Amino acid sequence: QRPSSVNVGALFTYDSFIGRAAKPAVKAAMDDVNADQSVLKGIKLNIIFQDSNCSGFIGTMGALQLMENKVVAAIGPQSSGIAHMISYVANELHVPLLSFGATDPTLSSLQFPYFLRTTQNDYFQMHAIADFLSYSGWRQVIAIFVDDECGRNGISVLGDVLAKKRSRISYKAAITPGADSSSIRDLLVSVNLMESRVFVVHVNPDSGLNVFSVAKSLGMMASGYVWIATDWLPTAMDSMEHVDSDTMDLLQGVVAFRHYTIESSVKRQFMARWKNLRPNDGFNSYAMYAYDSVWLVARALDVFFRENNNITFSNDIQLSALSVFNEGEKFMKIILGMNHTGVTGPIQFDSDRNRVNPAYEVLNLEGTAPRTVGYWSNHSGLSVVHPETLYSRPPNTSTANQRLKGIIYPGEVTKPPRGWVFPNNGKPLRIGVPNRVSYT
Amino acid sequence: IIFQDSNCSGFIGTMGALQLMENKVVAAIGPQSSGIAHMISYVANELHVPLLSFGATDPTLSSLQFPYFLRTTQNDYFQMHAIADFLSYSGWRQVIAIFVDDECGRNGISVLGDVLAKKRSRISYKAAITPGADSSSIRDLLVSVNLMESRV
Numbered sequence: 001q002r003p004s005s006v007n008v009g010a011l012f013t014y015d016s017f018i019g020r021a022a023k024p025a026v027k028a029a030m031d032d033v034n035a036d037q038s039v040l041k042g043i044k045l046n047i048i049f050q051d052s053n054c055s056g057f058i059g060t061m062g063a064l065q066l067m068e069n070k071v072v073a074a075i076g077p078q079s080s081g082i083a084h085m086i087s088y089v090a091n092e093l094h095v096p097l098l099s100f101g102a103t104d105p106t107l108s109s110l111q112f113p114y115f116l117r118t119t120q121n122d123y124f125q126m127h128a129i130a131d132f133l134s135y136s137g138w139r140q141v142i143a144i145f146v147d148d149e150c151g152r153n154g155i156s157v158l159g160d161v162l163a164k165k166r167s168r169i170s171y172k173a174a175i176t177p178g179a180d181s182s183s184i185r186d187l188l189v190s191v192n193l194m195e196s197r198v199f200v201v202h203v204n205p206d207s208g209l210n211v212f213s214v215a216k217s218l219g220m221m222a223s224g225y226v227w228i229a230t231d232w233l234p235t236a237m238d239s240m241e242h243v244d245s246d247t248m249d250l251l252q253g254v255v256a257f258r259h260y261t262i263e264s265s266v267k268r269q270f271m272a273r274w275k276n277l278r279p280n281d282g283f284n285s286y287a288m289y290a291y292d293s294v295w296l297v298a299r300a301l302d303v304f305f306r307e308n309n310n311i312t313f314s315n316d317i318q319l320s321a322l323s324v325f326n327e328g329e330k331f332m333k334i335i336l337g338m339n340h341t342g343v344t345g346p347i348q349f350d351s352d353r354n355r356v357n358p359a360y361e362v363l364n365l366e367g368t369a370p371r372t373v374g375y376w377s378n379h380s381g382l383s384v385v386h387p388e389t390l391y392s393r394p395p396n397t398s399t400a401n402q403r404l405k406g407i408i409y410p411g412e413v414t415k416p417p418r419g420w421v422f423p424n425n426g427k428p429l430r431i432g433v434p435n436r437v438s439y440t
Numbered sequence: 441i442i443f444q445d446s447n448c449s450g451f452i453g454t455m456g457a458l459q460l461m462e463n464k465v466v467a468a469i470g471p472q473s474s475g476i477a478h479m480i481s482y483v484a485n486e487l488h489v490p491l492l493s494f495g496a497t498d499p500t501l502s503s504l505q506f507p508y509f510l511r512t513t514q515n516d517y518f519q520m521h522a523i524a525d526f527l528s529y530s531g532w533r534q535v536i537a538i539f540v541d542d543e544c545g546r547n548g549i550s551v552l553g554d555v556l557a558k559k560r561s562r563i564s565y566k567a568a569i570t571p572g573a574d575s576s577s578i579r580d581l582l583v584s585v586n587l588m589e590s591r592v
């Protein structure tokens with residue numbers, strides 16, 4: 001018996017660069033699944049929203065209010081510290097937790113069986129940097145990361161993938177998540193006086209751009225300082241409606257990465273649909289995953305109701321009166337076997353719960369235009385062609401295949417600057433001079 | 441002393457500690473599972489109730505992002521030096537870690553990844569069992585760890 005309406009969850013912080021694009025995109029796909037009668041099936045899929053102020057407390061307390069409400073799924077957290085704890089209350093209520101902005105390389109494991117990840121695993125950027133570094137041959141990197149659950153799990157991977165190529169991370173500098181403009185200066189001064197100039201930065205996007213506004217005004221970004229940035233930096237730009245060309249002057253040589261997505265007419269009509277909406281045009285490509293995840297619910301919601309006649313619940317100071325979701329691991333099992341093609345190309349999940357084709361569009365920032373100096377893929381790694389071409393090929397592992405365009409490093413140089421710089425710390429260079437008696 | 445427990449799963453402990461916070465308290469003798477101790481140190485940070493652990497030993501808890509988590513046991517950061525002093529005392533220099541995949545395992549060994557770099561050693565292969573460990577997952581692991589490059 002197909003009911004009147006089904007309720008899914010939505011945990012995403014409204015007051016950030018991801019959520020202000022996510023909230024129309026979830027509202028957009030909700031309007032299309034109630035317009036598409038092939039997936040409607042007499043059911044009005046309304047989506048209960050539940051914001052959070054990016055804190056671990058009221059994220060869970062809002063989601064416990066979602067679990068007191070009846071749900072069948074929950075469009076997951078993107079904060080990735082909420083996504084640990086909610087994937088303990090979704091590991092005991094058997095509710096599938098489909099994240100769109102997780103990017104945490106420990107959530108795809110067997111201790112979290114109900115945490116499916118629609119975005120690409122952050123485990124692959126730390127390969128794509130560890131393919132980018134041994135491409136240029138720098139081999140000694142000093143990392144900078146916010147000390148959240150996303151940093152300490154992220155740069156622990158890059159410590160390990162660089163160990164296979166005999167590279168290493170020298171000094172895991174770590175900003176505190178509540179950071180003013182003083183704790184950034186106390187740290188970025190203390191890493192100028194060290195042995196490397198290849199900075200990986202992996203910071204949350206809202207306070208992420210305030211790292212470079214300290215690095216410019218400290219004299220760091222100059223000749224001989226390679227800045228590599230992960231996905232937050234294009235999300236810090238593309239969430240702004242137009243690049244204001246002062247922040248672009250801060251970013252002169254920083255080799256950022258970005259989630260590559262193959263184009264189609266479905267994504268093309270969505271971009272014109274996005275121009276029809278205008279939430280100040282903060283199109284930052286996480287809304288492209290947030291528009292995907294509602295379809296990935298709804299198409300899996302469609303297939304599950306051709307088998308099951310009806311969803312089923314139960315009943316279990318403030319007591320534990322939360323309604324558990326009976327018969328959920330069957331509904332979780334059909335979502336892993338999905339072969340849907342959303343707006344971001346094909347969707348498939350292998351045994352490691354990753355999405356099947358991770359591809360990163362490298363980009364350089366040298367002028368006022370971000371030009372894409374290559375494409376990283378899981379398949380080949382560092383092409384210059386669009387990485388959908390090589391997917392039918394055999395995996396070609398050649399040194400002539402790992403190839404990139406002209407890269408402009410900071411200081412307006414274009415030869416790859418040497419990483420090592422001798423430190424100015426309390427140790428002096430102990431030159432050992434012999435004490436000659438003959439032939440002085 | 442109001443006694444509440446978890447059953448070593450993180451779900452009912454945070455519900456049960458929220459019952460302690462639904463109750464009025466002036467302190468809280470902290471958890472020791474340290475998957476609990478991350479979440480309860482986000483409910484202590486919004487209720488200003490001091491959380492004092494005795495069995496935390498998770499070397500990412502002693503940070504200023506958690507202003508209300510004082511640790512009365514020895515910080516596990518000071519144990520991973522003692523292995524990294526014992527290894528360079530024997531001169532073994534290459535070590536295959538085995539850790540449960542809790543927060544005491546990843547943050548525990550990522551410290552040993554860091555401290556062995558300062559003495560120019562390294563960890564070969566961070567093998568990682570799941571939290572609910574069968575006696576078949578350990579055989580599936582430790583067969584594939586005999587076939588590697590280190591014995592320490």
Ligand SMILES: *[C@@H]1O[C@H](CO)[C@@H](O[C@@H]2O[C@H](CO)[C@@H](O)[C@H](O)[C@H]2NC(C)=O)[C@H](O)[C@H]1NC(C)=O
Pocket residue numbers: 350351354355356357358378379
């Ligand atoms: C990313 O690429 C690697 C390399 O091919 C994939 O690893 C392979 O996975 C299949 C089954 O998943 C195994 O049979 C192969 O032996 C693996 N190859 C290697 C070299 O390990 C990996 O699965 C890819 N990721 C995704 C999400 O598809």
Ligand SMILES: N[C@@H](CCC(=O)N[C@@H](CS)C(=O)NCC(=O)O)C(=O)O
Pocket residue numbers: 013016017018054078079080101102103104122150202203204205206207230231232
């Ligand atoms: N928590 C963020 C909002 C959401 C967010 O961006 N979370 C991080 C945690 S991992 C993220 O998704 N980062 C993507 C990345 O840098 O790879 C904030 O401080 O506003």
Ligand SMILES: N[C@@H](CCC(=O)N[C@@H](CS)C(=O)NCC(=O)O)C(=O)O
Pocket residue numbers: 448472473474495496497498516542544
């Ligand atoms: N969580 C444990 C019981 C409590 C416990 O022992 N927690 C661990 C994880 S922090 C601990 O105290 N470890 C101390 C140590 O290994 O140094 C269990 O499996 O039931």
Ligand SMILES: *[C@@H]1O[C@H](CO)[C@@H](O)[C@H](O)[C@H]1NC(C)=O
Pocket residue numbers: 339
């Ligand atoms: C998914 O679909 C593609 C073509 O649409 C097919 O080649 C592939 O085998 C399918 N995978 C499945 C059914 O697991």
Ligand SMILES: *[C@H]1O[C@H](CO)[C@@H](O)[C@H](O)[C@H]1NC(C)=O
Pocket residue numbers: 015053
């Ligand atoms: C967090 O930010 C929100 C939105 O700006 C605002 O309500 C307030 O400053 C904070 N909320 C609380 C009380 O945590």
Ligand SMILES: *[C@H]1O[C@H](CO)[C@@H](O)[C@H](O)[C@H]1NC(C)=O
Pocket residue numbers: 447448449
């Ligand atoms: C402990 O008992 C609980 C009931 O509170 C039940 O989940 C199980 O038998 C035990 N749980 C664990 C994981 O120890």
